[PDB]
Amino acid sequence: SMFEFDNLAPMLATHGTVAGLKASQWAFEGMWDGYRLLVEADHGAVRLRSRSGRDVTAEYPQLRALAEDLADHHVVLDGEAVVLDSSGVPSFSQMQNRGRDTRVEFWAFDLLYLDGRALLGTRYQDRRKLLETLANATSLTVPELLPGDGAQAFACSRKHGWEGVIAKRRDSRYQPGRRCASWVKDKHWNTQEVVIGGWRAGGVGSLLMGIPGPGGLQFAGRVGTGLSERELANLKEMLAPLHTDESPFDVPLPARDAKGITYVKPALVAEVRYSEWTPEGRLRQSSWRGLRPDKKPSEVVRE
Ligand SMILES: Nc1ncnc2c1ncn2[C@@H]1O[C@H](COP(=O)(O)OP(=O)(O)OP(=O)(O)O)[C@@H](O)[C@H]1O
Ligand SMILES: [Mg+2]
Ligand SMILES: [Mg+2]
């Protein structure tokens, strides 16, 4: 049969503003900071497909039982694998640094195929109804839409501490692998890539962030929030080989910022969320999202 899960790439959203959109036209979903997954559940047997289009089934054994209540069905799902922090908010860093005791959940937000019917050409409104009929009172988690028009859904989403809202046009088709104007993503917090220039201990109580410039890293502040247990342990192994006596910053750090510090060669790129930039170039109310081993320091610029 000719729907090819093995040829499927996820649909992508366009950065925009949702506050002026109406629920009559747009479905407001919460934005889940996790790992994007396509899921084929063929009468209970689950296969997972990354956005890059590769089998990642073996990387999430906690999801092997995802379809335990769906053994009578053959479905393709779209959703986010999440790991919930102590607030029950999906945490990206707890996902990327997950262990065997780590609870991974799959939160489904689309249905692409159901018992021999491919649904790429079916309107979102109708796919969602089939998704609800499939998952009601099962262990398959389908987060509901946020109530209200756009500004209310966005506010509610902020109240929960979620990442933002994705508005999906109720009449829209599913376009694999395409970034479309029919999905609008709107994030609550700004986000900045940084280069790690040093660390303090309580261990690693915090990191010293910088933006590359002509004379070295321009100090962008200290991040300590959003980091716990498993990740810091890995941070210590990534930092160890980078030990250096020379500071990488373009001005010697103020004494308060340099207290108990070890400098590292400016190699690791991380990502943080922040409210605003101070007039002197520090990140306000920064919090850790995670490390970005795909990026290298020479691409970090003030965004
Ligand atoms: N409810 C949801 N529906 C669809 N996608 C979601 C949802 N929640 C989270 N995501 C995914 O989380 C990410 C949030 O957008 P963000 O701008 O943070 O992503 P990105 O990695 O910067 O860019 P990209 O759009 O290329 O992934 C998007 O990948 C989005 O597809
Ligand atoms: Mg994201
Ligand atoms: Mg992404």
Rg (CA), the chain: 21
Residue 47 CB coordination number (10 Å): 15
| Residue after which a domain boundary falls, among 154, 187, 220 | 187
Asked if residue 199 and residue 86 are part of one domain, the reply reads: no
Q: Which is the closest atom of ligand 1 to the Cα of 30?
A: 1
Asked if residue 169 and residue 56 are part of one domain, the reply reads: yes
Amino acid at position 275, single letter: S
Residue-range definition of the domain harbouring residue 2: 1-187
Beta bridge partner(s), residue 212: 217
36 CB less than 6 Å from ligand 1? yes
Determine the Cα angle at 44 with ends 82 and 84, to 5°.
10
Asked if residue 157 and residue 77 are part of one domain, the reply reads: yes
Asked if residue 216 and residue 171 are part of one domain, the reply reads: no
67-71: list long-range contacts, CB under 8 Å, 24+ apart: 67/39, 67/41, 67/140, 68/44, 68/139, 69/138, 69/139, 69/140, 70/41, 70/44, 70/134, 70/138, 70/140, 71/43, 71/44
- 8-state DSSP, 299: G
Which tokens belong to 275? Answer: 């409210």
Amino acid at position 12, single letter: L
Resolution, Å (one decimal) = 1.8
| Residue after which a domain boundary falls, among 156, 172, 187 | 187
Asked if residue 112 and residue 34 are part of one domain, the reply reads: yes
43 alpha carbon – ligand 1 mean position (Å): 29
Asked if residue 139 and residue 8 are part of one domain, the reply reads: yes
280 alpha carbon – ligand 1 mean position (Å): 31
| Residue after which a domain boundary falls, among 130, 159, 187 | 187
Asked if residue 178 and residue 118 are part of one domain, the reply reads: yes
Asked if residue 136 and residue 20 are part of one domain, the reply reads: yes
Amino acid at position 112, single letter: L
Which amino acid residue places its CA nearest to atom 2 of ligand 1? 31
Say which experimental method was used.
Answer: X-ray
Asked if residue 149 and residue 204 are part of one domain, the reply reads: no
33 alpha carbon – ligand 2 mean position (Å): 6
Asked if residue 36 and residue 48 are part of one domain, the reply reads: yes
- Total tally of structural domains belonging to the chain: 2
Asked if residue 156 and residue 208 are part of one domain, the reply reads: no
Asked if residue 283 and residue 183 are part of one domain, the reply reads: no
Residue of 15, 31, 154 to test ligand 1 pocket, by largest number of atoms within 8 Å of CB: 31
Q: Are 67 and 77 in contact (CB under 8 A)?
A: no
In this structure, what CATH number is given to the domain that contains residue 242?
A: 2.40.50.140
